[PDB]
Structure 1
Amino acid sequence: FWKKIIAYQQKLLNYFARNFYNMRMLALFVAFAINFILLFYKVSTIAVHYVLEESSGYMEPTLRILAILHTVISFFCIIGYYCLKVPLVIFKREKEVARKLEFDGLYITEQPSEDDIKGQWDRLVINTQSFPNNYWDKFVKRKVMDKYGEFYGRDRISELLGMDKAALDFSDAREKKKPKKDSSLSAVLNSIDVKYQMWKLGVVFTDNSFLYLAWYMTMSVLGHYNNFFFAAHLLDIAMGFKTLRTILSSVTHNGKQLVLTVGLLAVVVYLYTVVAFNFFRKFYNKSEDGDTPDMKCDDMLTCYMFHMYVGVRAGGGIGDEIEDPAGDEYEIYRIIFDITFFFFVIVILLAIIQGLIIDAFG
């Protein structure tokens, strides 16, 4: 019974591992169909509800079929990922922890720095009986024992690595044992290694590709309550496509200089808001109703928002959206203010952003 059922289990696992990448392209094609049907989606009249316009009438059932197909394929892409790319992650983690045990003594001479989540989580797998489950080297415990045994102890190292103390010697010596049955549920439950499957799950839950695929599943499940969460699946083109990664690498190559440039602009337009709030306040009225002014620089936060939004998005600077300065005592000063805002923000600081993207292509 439980030879054939696991045979079918391995059949399903191998099928999903084989078709991980093929269902990863289908979950992207279903998204462009759902989001193409969503372009024929109206609002109808207060009780307001969104209605899918349709002259044929075939769009509404098709959208509900494709909403379930997408949800099924997303779950299959998680099963497929676990079948295919999780063993590689486990092998890579097991190799690193074993080689740090042996050639660095990460848990004998040193200890994790209490802020390394991987180093602290790798404490559990050392004592497991099913260690190098994926890594080839089955003698890593016997190697660490031979290396660090004399100085740090035959018994301390054995306790740390969770290797048998003296039953192994007695078994090489005289003892007897009784076999067990595969069909035995007690046998299976005793054979399964709780402490190792815990660390494995903890590593998978920290994997940065399993978490993204789980987000892709959660936002596909949420796409049934509201069909507009299926538009968040079009952010998957950067990952699925490999040619949209050259275009998107120009932004992300100098991606830290494009954040410290916006921060620098946020400070520059702040030093202009300071000058405006201290000296140019009569020029920030935004209506013709003389009875009620709409002063947008009578408060520091409001003036800063004005400068950050309208002055920044303006094609000539802050001076296109404020009162004309002619025939005023602060006229040449306010001309300098506007021309320097245009030069330093619209021209120069918006040229650094262009040049950072351009210098990334090269």
Structure 2
Amino acid sequence: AYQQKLLNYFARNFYNMRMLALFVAFAINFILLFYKVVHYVLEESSGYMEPTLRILAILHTVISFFCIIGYYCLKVPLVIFKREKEVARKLEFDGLYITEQPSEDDIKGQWDRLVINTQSFPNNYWDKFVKRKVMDKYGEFYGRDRISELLGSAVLNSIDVKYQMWKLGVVFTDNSFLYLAWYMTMSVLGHYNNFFFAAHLLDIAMGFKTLRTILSSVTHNGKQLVLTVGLLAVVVYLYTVVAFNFFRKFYNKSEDGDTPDMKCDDMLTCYMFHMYVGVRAGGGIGDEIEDPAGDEYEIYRIIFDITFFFFVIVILLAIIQGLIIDAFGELRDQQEQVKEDMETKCFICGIGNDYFDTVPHGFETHTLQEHNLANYLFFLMYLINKDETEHTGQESYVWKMYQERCWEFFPAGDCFRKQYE
């Protein structure tokens, strides 16, 4: 009645669906500032806002469900089209499941050890004649009838069964699909509880990418940052031995001794104490400890403070900051490097920005005409469009070159200006 008719609408606005889906989550989490304890909902406004909250807590959820619908349209089988194209051409060139039988790894690939026999095998890729083609590539060698058989209302039992199961088993192994599925499970709890249900707001980390500059400026460098954490841990694991063996009188979290005077004379206790305090110190661990004013080991105590005062507070702060700002310069230089190499000499011939603009206003047009990279794609549409019975020799020729999957015809260093004088 409306089924596949409206189906185009969902991917047709799926990005805008996603935008309004994340747009709701602000006003979801916005109202929880108007809370009061027990859990009380304050409305210092037109008091029907709480019933509209009761509305929107499931309205956002069915919006997210519609987002998964439009995604299930959109960024679905093209990925498995790629996967299927890959495994088809790799069994074609290689016969991996026939001759090679790959290892315990590539669970993605070993998942396709169960799609080999499947009936409508390129169900959205190209053609199934390639199966018979590679039978003729290999079945006379090893097993002709063996490997071919190894390949192969009223909708009552007329379905792809195990091919569909394989398809789903690939489908689960997606980042963004699982991201949005997790987002759906996040939006589940409006019917359950807003304990964590208003905490959808992680989705800004994949909604706008403007912020992802910063997150990437962290995340490539974090592999050393965990080691910074480790060295912090071990240097304080060192420091907690010292006064524990030598200044337990200088331990005092006591309320001036007349109370049950508190000193961490256990290694773990003073360790966690330095972790809680001496990390968050700022002014030094000598701030939150017994000062000496005449101790035998007073200068030892002082020098212990000084070594802390430097080696924690100065050093590791500066370490993390300098890591971050060299990460800044790294990422900026990488970005503009990419920009320059695009804006130098061409991609295709790739000879000289100066060289095809030796004649003025040439090189950009030399790009836009002699290389014009989308036009080669257009040309492939042109070739895959028409029939080889009507190809010219160039057309049939490069068609066959592509059929060979060879790609020699592209201009290395040999453009038209380069061709002549």
Q: Is the 8 A contact 2:57 2:190 kept in 1?
A: yes
Tell me if structure 1 keeps the 8 A contact 2:278–2:285.
yes
Q: Is the 8 A contact 2:92 2:130 kept in 1?
A: yes
> What is the CA-CA distance between 1:265 and the residue it aligns to?
1.1
- More deviation, 130-139/28-37: 130-139
Task: State the Cα deviation string for residues 141-169 of structure 1 (Å, max 9, x = none).
Answer: 2343233323332133224323xxxxxxx
Q: Report the alpha carbon displacement of residue 321 of structure 1 after superposing the two structures with TM.
A: 1.5
Note closer, same or farther for the CA distance 1:8–1:335 as it changes in structure 2 (3 Å cut).
Answer: same
| Deviation (angstroms), 1:98 | 1.8
Residue 96 to residue 330, structure 1, CA distance change in 2 (3 Å)? farther
- Structure 2 residue aligned with 1:18: 12
Shift of 1:288: 1.9
Distance in 1 (alpha carbons) for counterparts of 2:296 and 2:196: 56
* Further displaced range: 134-143 or 191-200: 134-143
Question: Distance between the aligned counterparts of 1:188 and 1:16, measured in 2?
Answer: 25
Q: Tell me which moved more, 270-279 or 7-16.
A: 7-16
Question: What secondary structure, in the 3-state scheme, does the structure 1 residue paired with 2:41 have?
Answer: strand
- Give the whole-Å Cα distance in 2 for the aligned partners of 1:139 and 1:277: 78
* Distance across 2 between alignment mates of 1:138 and 1:351: 61
Q: Contact conserved, 2:22 with 2:203, CA < 8 A, in 1?
A: yes
Given candidates 21, 27, 30, the residue that maps to 1:33 is 27
How far residue 320 of structure 1 moved from its aligned partner, in angstroms, is 2.0
**Residues 111 and 300 (structure 1 numbering): CA distance in 2 closer, same or farther, change over 3 Å?**
farther
Out of 93, 99, 103, the position equivalent to 1:109 is 99
Q: 1:198 to 1:327 in 2, by over 3 A?
A: same
Give the conservation status (yes or no) of the 8 Å contact 2:244–2:267.
Answer: yes
Instruction: Identify which of structures 1 and 2 has the higher relative contact order when contacts are C-alpha pairs closer than 8 Å and 6+ apart.
Output: 1
Displacement of 1:22: 0.9
Q: Which moved more, 1:337-346 or 1:126-135?
A: 337-346
Q: Distance in 2 between the 1:294 and 1:112 partners?
A: 67
Aligned CA distance change for structure 1 residues 156 and 340 (closer, same or farther; 3 Å) = farther
Deviation at 1:86, TM superposition (A): 1.4
For residues 322 and 8 of structure 1, do their structure 2 counterparts lie closer, same or farther at Cα, with a shift above 3 Å needed? Answer: same
- Please report how far the alpha carbon of residue 217 of structure 1 lies from its aligned counterpart in structure 2 after TM superposition: 0.9
Single out whichever of 292-301 and 339-348 deviates more from structure 2. 292-301
Distance 1:37 1:197 in 2: 44
Give the gaps of 5 or more residues in structure 1: 1-6, 163-185
* Closer/same/farther in 2, CA of residues 321 and 79 from structure 1, 3 Å limit: same
Q: Which structure shows the bigger proportion of residues in helix conformation? A: 1
1:278–1:9 distance in 2 versus 1, CA, 3 Å? same
- Write the deviation string for residues 20-76 of structure 1: whole angstroms up to 9, x where unpaired: 111100111111112122221222xxxx33333434313212211211210111101
- TM-score between both structures, scaled by the size of structure 2: 0.73
Contact 1:285 1:294 in 2 (8 A): yes
Residues 343, 106 of structure 1: CA spacing in aligned structure 2 closer, same or farther, 3 A cutoff?
farther
| Cα distance change, pair 103–263 in 1 and its aligned pair in 2 (3 A) | farther
Task: Go from structure 1 to structure 2 and tell me whether the alpha carbon gap of 1:270 and 1:55 turns closer, same or farther (over 3 Å shift).
Answer: same
Question: Matched residue of 1:76: which SS?
Answer: helix
Using the alignment, how far apart are the partners of 1:75 and 1:273 within structure 2?
Answer: 53
| Change in 2 beyond 3 A, CA 1:188/1:357 | same
Q: CA deviation at 1:329?
A: 2.0
TM-score by length of 1: 0.84
Cα contact 1:95–1:135 (8 A) shared by 2: yes
Q: Alpha-carbon deviations, 1:307-333, whole Å to 9, x = none? A: 222111111332221111332122222
Shift of 1:296: 4.9
CA 115–39 in structure 1, closer or farther in 2 if over 3 Å, else same: same
Report the counterpart of residue 58 of structure 2 in structure 1. Answer: 68
Asked if 1 retains the 8 angstrom alpha-carbon contact of 2:61 and 2:187, the reply is: yes
258-267 or 282-291: which moved more?
282-291
Instruction: For 1:100 and 1:92, locate their aligned partners in 2 and report how far apart those are by CA, in whole Å.
Output: 12
For the residue of structure 2 that corresponds to 1:355, the secondary structure is helix
Distance 1:152 1:330 in 2: 85
Shift of 1:228: 4.2
SS at match of 1:57: coil
Deviations 1:259-305 (A, max 9, x none): 12112211111111122322222222112252444545322222221
State the Cα deviation string for residues 96-129 of structure 1 (Å, max 9, x = none).
2223322343322323332432122111211101
Change (3 A) 1:291 1:19: same
Structure 1 position 241 matched with structure 2 position 235? no
Where in structure 2 are there 5+ consecutive unaligned residues?
A: 330-421
3-state DSSP of counterpart to 2:197: helix
CA contact (8 A) 2:252 2:262 kept: yes
Once the two structures are TM-superposed, the CA of residue 88 in structure 1 deviates from its matched residue by 1.9
Sequence identity, in percent?
A: 100
Query: Does the 8 Å CA contact 2:264/2:270 hold for their aligned counterparts?
Result: yes
Q: Aligned partners of 2:91 and 2:302: how far apart in 1?
A: 69
- Alpha-carbon distance in structure 2 between the residues aligned to 1:151 and 1:342: 76
Tell me which moved more, 258-267 or 107-116.
Answer: 107-116
Change over 3 Å in CA distance of 1:263–1:62 after alignment to 2: same
